[PDB]
Design a protein around this ligand. Structure first.
Ligand SMILES: CCCCNC(=O)N1CCN(C(=O)c2ccco2)C[C@@H]1C
Length: 120
């Protein structure tokens, strides 16, 4: 399965599944500072799933590793802001992270395998 470009549609499909998850609601658009006025005091690099989808669709990711780094930033940012491990939004972030990691694993493996085959 040595298609170097196949990761992009696989990531579009995975983002579609993440948007269907009720657990993605809080992460679907850039955080609003009116509700959380100190957000940029704690969070240096805001990230959300709409920004990840737009970056993919603009052709501004070179690899699925770069998309994975941005999705992981959504989850680390949510953790940086949670007042507790028992908070609702943080709890939704942990389930969504587990779902994302379960699905991205093969996308990364296939891509890296395809690049190694190209350079063989
Ligand atoms: C009662 C509050 C309503 C939900 N809002 C809320 O608590 N949020 C702050 C923390 N957060 C994030 O850090 C984050 C990462 C990616 C997108 O947002 C999620 C959400 C916007």
């Amino acid at each position: 399965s040595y298609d170097i470009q196949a990761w992009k549609k696989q990531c579009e499909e995975l983002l579609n599944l993440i948007f269907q998850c009720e657990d993605s609601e809080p992460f679907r658009q850039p955080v609003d500072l009116l509700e959380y006025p100190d957000y940029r005091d704690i969070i240096d690099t805001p990230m959300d799933f709409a920004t990840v989808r737009e970056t993919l669709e603009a052709g501004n990711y070179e690899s699925p590793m770069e998309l994975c780094k941005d999705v992981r930033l959504i989850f680390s940012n949510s953790k940086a802001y949670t007042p507790s491990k028992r908070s609702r939004i943080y709890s939704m972030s942990l389930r969504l992270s587990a779902f994302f990691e379960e699905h991205i694993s093969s996308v990364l493996s296939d891509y890296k395998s395809a690049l190694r085959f190209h350079k063989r």
